[PDB]
Every structure is written in structure tokens, then in C-alpha cells.
Design a protein around this ligand. Structure first.
Ligand SMILES: [Br-]
Ligand SMILES: [Br-]
Ligand SMILES: [Br-]
Ligand SMILES: [Br-]
Ligand SMILES: [Br-]
Ligand SMILES: [Br-]
Ligand SMILES: [Br-]
Ligand SMILES: [Br-]
Ligand SMILES: [Br-]
Ligand SMILES: [Br-]
Ligand SMILES: [Br-]
Ligand SMILES: [Br-]
Ligand SMILES: [Br-]
Length: 587
């Protein structure tokens, strides 16, 4: 059959925030001829401008990068052959309320559509809003792993199949539980997957063929969870995609008002709807009800801050931003201003939830959980992969970044815990930091620490980290100086095993290029977490000063110590132990 039998979310890119910079470049070619051979000139000029983008300075086809921008309603080619940018594409190019733009586009997203119609996508088989299908399915099955999405969701082609696939997942789960033996369970699962795709791609080395289908499905499932979590309607709970408990009413309305419109065969008529980021218009998107929503979020944020500020006065950072955001309603109260206030207020609530983790970590079980997961990174690669896949959606390299960041939060005192990796609305990890950024920036009152982490080993470690770390350091220092920020910059480089050549390369930059890179073993980093744990046990905790002094002391050792690897290494352990002993904790 030529009929397609699955939908997909693009893997180019697989994480949705990487579209904006592409789209901003593409918007420059609005009004360009973009069809046929006359289309070549503009499309090749675009391709060159895009290859200069940081994310591509590490070779695709232009058509391949543009396709998701068409599928999600940001751009189209009109009937006269010119490239056009929709209002949704314009908003995202300008970075206005991007997660909200994605929510509305992916809620409207349907099959068939202008991009996916005709012979390949017959209405007899196709009538689905993939994101909404998945919201409705989760109401039935609670959660979906990436494998669940690959096995059951992508091959759903009609909104009316929610109940049937719900029933089938539960029957799959009920049987799988009966299979005794973890390995046995893996094989059952894999064979259930093989058979299902068999009846479905029954179309036409067989096994080699449906195994490619299965592999593709897994790939797409990953991308799907990242795009869907980006909207905020979904979050991770362990290794499962689940509904965001704080968006219940919004999710109810989405399910209720979603639809497959039939006006998709001509490009203009379809994009007048699909490219409109005001559509669908939700019940509460009136001035009157947006005031109420803005005020509800303000009260939530206030409640949060006030619970924290007595023991964690660094939340005074978000309290003031909060005041600046809402002072705009003083000047003007219209729907657009309200939307912006509400967008920034949710962003700030997330910032408050990061400081709230400080209070969570007062419970030693919570704190030790972070330590214990970090300790997993001393195990062999196969063990790490298994333990992390069972507890997270994100891969183990991303999770190592997230765990190290939680480590900074446990030590406390920062003004901002700036993860550069992506997290979702429940603070769970999604996508690794970009190649041109350190993994995180922890800003304190009078110093700043970059966190650079890797699970890399030996020469590929040297390979991977020597230039980017020293470059990220130097770019940041440059930026701070241009911005007039009078704070010393440190970089903490953390690996389970720090390679001597990597180490020696950072020592050379420290003394030669005036960097302040401090290489700390995962074991040494975990020691810090244990020192804080014991202090909290005794009613104390580390101060901002304490952390500064560690950074300064270790820094000084890197440049004052004798120029010999073994000496500097032992000097750093010495300095560390002093600091630790100074805390007078049971060690
Ligand atoms: Br980029
Ligand atoms: Br194209
Ligand atoms: Br696509
Ligand atoms: Br098009
Ligand atoms: Br919305
Ligand atoms: Br998977
Ligand atoms: Br099971
Ligand atoms: Br077995
Ligand atoms: Br996200
Ligand atoms: Br604080
Ligand atoms: Br590893
Ligand atoms: Br992994
Ligand atoms: Br990633």
C-alpha cells in the first residue's frame, strides 16, 4: 500500500528549541521564489546562512531542515511559488512566548494536513491530532515510556482509537507482568513489538526490515517526548511521559475543542487557520479571565517565596523579578500584555521551584538520593545505562548534567542555578546543553562557577573537553567584562575519571591564559555533598563564603603548586581535605 501507516515528530532537530534559530535565518528569505529550479538560488543561499549557525558548527539537505517548519505551521510555499512566514512562524522567529507558540501549533497539528494529504493520507484511515491523541491516551493509561510510544502511538492514525489502544496497552502490561524473569520480560516485550509492527508494516531480509521500522519508531518516540514536554502539557515522571498535574483544566479544554479541519487541500486556506498562533482561542483567553489567571500565578509564586524566604533568602532574587513583571500591568492591561506577564510569571515560578529544592534537600533521604545516583557513575557503562533508563527519559549524559546541577543546589547559596541543559516543568531533564555552552552557570553574590561535566574517559575525554571547556571559560569571561560584572569566574570540571592530559591542559591554561579551571573527580565532588549532608544533620550548612573559599583555595593551588601533574593533583586533594576538615564534620 502507498498509504502511510504512522505519523512522526521530526528528528531534525529532535529537540524543539533548536528550531528557533533556524527559523530566524529562514525568515530572511520571505518572499523569495522557493519552487523548482528558480527556487535553487534562494534555497542554496539559505543553506549557507544556516550552516554558519552554532548548532551546525560541529551536512543535511535544506528540504530536510525546512520540513518540520512546514509541518508545525511556521512557514509554507504559496501557490505562486514564494516562501511565506506565518504569524506563528513570525512569533517564534522573534522568540515571543515560544513554548506557548509550540503548544498552540502542536494542538492544531493534524493528519491529514496541507503537508500530509491525498493518496498517502486517506481520510478513511487518517483523522488524528497526535498530541491530543496522546493526552487522551494518558488519561487512560497514566504514563508512557518512549518504548510505549514507539510501539503503540505512532501507528495510531485516528483520534477514535484512544480506547482501543488504551485497552491494548493494559493487556500488554498485564501479560508482561506474568512473564517471570526480567530477561524473559525483555524478550516478550521485544517480540510483542516485532509481531505488532509485522501485522502493521505487513506491506512490502524481512526481520532486517521491520527491525528498521522498530528502530525508527524508537528514534521518533524520543523526539516526540521532547517536543511534547516543551509545551508544558506533559512532564516526565521517572522514565514515563505523563500529564502535567498543574494543567488539568487546560488539557480538558484541549481534548474537548480539538478537531481535524477539512480545509487542508489548498495552501492558503489551510495556513490562515494553522499558521495563526491565536488559534485555538481558549475559554480563559479574555482580558477578564487572563487577569484572573495572572493573579492566580502571582499568588502561587508568593506562597512559594514566602515559604522559603526565612531559611533561603536567595529567593529574594525571584521576588524582585516578580515585582518587575507585574508592574507592567500598572501601565497597561490588555490581552497581549497579560499573556506576556503570564508567560514570564510561569518562567519565574520554575525558578522558584528550583530554589524550593533547597528546602527539599533538608530531608537527608532526598539529598542522599542525589548522592547515590551520582555514585552510579562509577559503575561500568552497561550498568549505568540500565539504571538510568529505568529512572529517567533522558540519556545518561544529560542525567549526569542534571545530577551535578542538583549537587550545586544541595550546596546552596546561589543567586541563580542556571542549567544550560533543558528541563521540563517538573524540573526533569530533557536535552543536553548546547555545544557552545557550559553545562551550567551557577551565579553567586560575588563569584560565578561554571559546571562542566562529562562521563567521557581517557583520550576521547581529552578529545571532547579540552577545547570546549577552555573556550566556554574564555567566552564567558569576555562577556562578563563587556557586561561590567565584577565577579571572579571559576570552572569546576567534573568527571568520574579525570584524564591526566585533560588535567594538565587545564593547569597550563590556568597559569598561561589566566583561566580558573578546577578539575574535581566525581568522588571529590560527591565528598562536598556529603559534607553538606552532615552539616545539615547538625543544624548547620555551608555558607556562600564557604563555597567561595573552596573555589579560591583550589584555584590558588592550581597555579602556585610545583609544575608537575602528580604534585598538583596531590595538592588539590590536600587543599580539599583541609576545607573538609575545617567543617568539623564526622569524617
Ligand atoms: Br544555533
Ligand atoms: Br524546502
Ligand atoms: Br517533519
Ligand atoms: Br508548503
Ligand atoms: Br496556552
Ligand atoms: Br526506547
Ligand atoms: Br512487567
Ligand atoms: Br532468561
Ligand atoms: Br521542556
Ligand atoms: Br539562601
Ligand atoms: Br559511562
Ligand atoms: Br542512557
Ligand atoms: Br541530548
Amino acid at each position: 500500500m502507498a498509504k502511510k501507516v504512522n505519523w512522526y515528530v521530526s528528528c531534525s532537530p529532535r529537540s524543539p528549541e533548536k528550531i528557533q534559530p533556524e527559523l530566524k535565518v529562514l525568515a530572511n528569505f520571505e518572499g523569495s521564489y522557493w519552487k523548482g529550479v528558480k527556487g535553487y538560488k534562494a534555497q542554496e543561499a539559505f543553506a549557507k546562512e544556516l550552516a554558519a549557525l552554532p548548532q551546525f558548527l560541529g551536512a543535511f539537505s535544506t528540504r530536510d531542515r525546512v520540513a518540520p517548519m512546514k509541518t508545525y505551521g511556521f512557514v509554507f510555499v504559496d501557490e505562486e511559488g514564494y516562501l511565506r512566514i506565518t504569524e506563528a512562524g513570525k512569533m517564534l522567529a522573534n522568540n515571543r512566548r515560544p513554548k506557548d507558540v509550540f503548544l498552540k501549533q502542536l494542538v492544531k497539528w493534524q493528519y491529514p494536513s496541507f503537508q500530509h494529504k491525498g493518496k498517502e493520507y486517506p481520510e478513511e484511515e487518517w483523522s488524528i491530532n497526535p498530541l491530543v491523541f496522546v493526552l487522551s491516551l494518558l488519561k487512560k493509561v497514566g504514563g508512557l515510556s518512549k518504548l510505549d510510544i514507539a510501539m503503540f502511538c505512532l501507528t495510531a492514525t485516528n483520534n477514535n482509537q484512544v480506547d482501543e489502544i488504551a485497552e491494548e496497552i493494559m493487556q500488554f502490561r498485564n501479560e508482561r507482568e506474568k512473564i517471570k524473569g526480567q530477561n524473559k520480560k525483555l524478550e516478550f516485550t521485544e517480540n510483542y513489538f516485532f509481531k505488532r509492527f509485522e501485522k502493521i508494516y505487513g506491506n512490502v531480509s524481512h526481520k532486517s526490515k521491520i527491525e528498521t521500522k522498530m528502530r525508527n519508531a524508537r528514534d521518533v518516540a524520543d523526539a516526540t517526548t521532547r517536543y511534547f514536554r516543551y509545551t508544558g502539557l506533559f512532564v516526565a515522571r521517572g522514565n514515563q511521559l505523563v500529564l502535567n498535574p498543574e494543567k488539568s483544566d487546560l488539557i480538558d479544554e484541549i481534548i474537548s475543542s480539538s478537531k481535524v479541519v477539512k480545509n487542508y487541500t489548498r495552501v492558503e486556506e489551510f495556513h490562515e487557520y494553522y499558521g495563526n498562533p491565536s488559534l485555538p482561542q481558549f475559554s480563559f483567553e479574555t482580558k477578564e479571565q487572563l487577569l484572573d489567571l495572572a493573579h492566580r500565578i502571582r499568588d502561587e509564586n508568593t506562597r512559594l517565596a514566602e515559604q522559603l524566604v526565612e531559611h533561603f533568602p536567595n529567593v529574594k532574587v525571584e521576588i524582585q523579578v516578580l515585582e518587575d513583571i507585574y508592574n507592567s500591568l500598572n501601565k497597561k492591561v490588555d490581552v497581549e500584555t497579560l499573556k506576556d506577564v503570564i508567560y514570564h510569571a510561569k518562567e519565574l515560578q520554575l525558578e522558584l521551584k528550583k530554589k524550593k529544592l533547597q528546602a527539599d534537600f533538608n530531608d537527608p533521604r532526598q539529598l542522599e538520593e542525589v548522592i547515590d545516583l551520582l555514585e552510579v557513575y562509577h559503575e561500568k557503562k552497561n550498568v549505568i545505562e540500565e539504571k538510568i533508563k529505568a529512572r529517567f527519559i533522558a540519556n545518561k549524559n544529560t542525567v549526569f548534567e542534571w545530577l551535578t546541577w542538583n549537587g550545586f543546589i544541595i550546596l546552596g547559596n546561589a543567586l541563580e542555578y542556571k542549567n544550560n541543559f533543558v528541563i521540563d516543568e517538573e524540573l526533569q531533564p530533557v536535552t543536553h546543553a548546547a555545544g557552545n555552552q557550559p553545562d551550567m552557570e551557577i551565579i553567586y553574590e560575588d563569584f560565578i562557577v561554571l559546571g562542566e561535566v562529562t562521563t567521557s574517559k581517557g583520550a576521547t575525554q581529552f578529545k571532547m573537553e579540552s577545547e570546549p571547556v577552555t573556550r566556554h571559560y574564555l567566552n564567558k569571561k569576555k562577556e562578563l567584562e563587556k557586561q561590567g560584572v565584577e565577579k571572579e569566574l571559576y570552572c569546576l570540571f567534573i568527571a568520574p575519571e579525570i584524564n591526566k592530559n585533560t588535567f594538565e591542559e587545564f593547569m597550563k591554561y590556568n597559569i598561561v591564559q589566566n583561566t580558573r579551571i578546577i578539575p574535581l573527580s566525581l568522588k571529590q565532588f560527591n565528598m562536598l555533598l556529603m559534607v553538606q549532608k552532615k552539616l545539615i544533620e547538625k543544624g548547620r550548612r555551608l555558607s556562600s563564603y564557604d563555597i567561595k573559599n573552596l573555589m579560591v583555595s583550589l584555584y590558588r593551588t592550581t597555579i602556585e603548586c610545583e609544575r608537575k601533574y602528580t604534585q598538583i593533583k596531590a595538592g588539590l586533594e590536600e587543599t580539599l581535605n583541609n576545607w573538609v576538615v575545617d567543617k568539623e564534620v564526622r569524617f
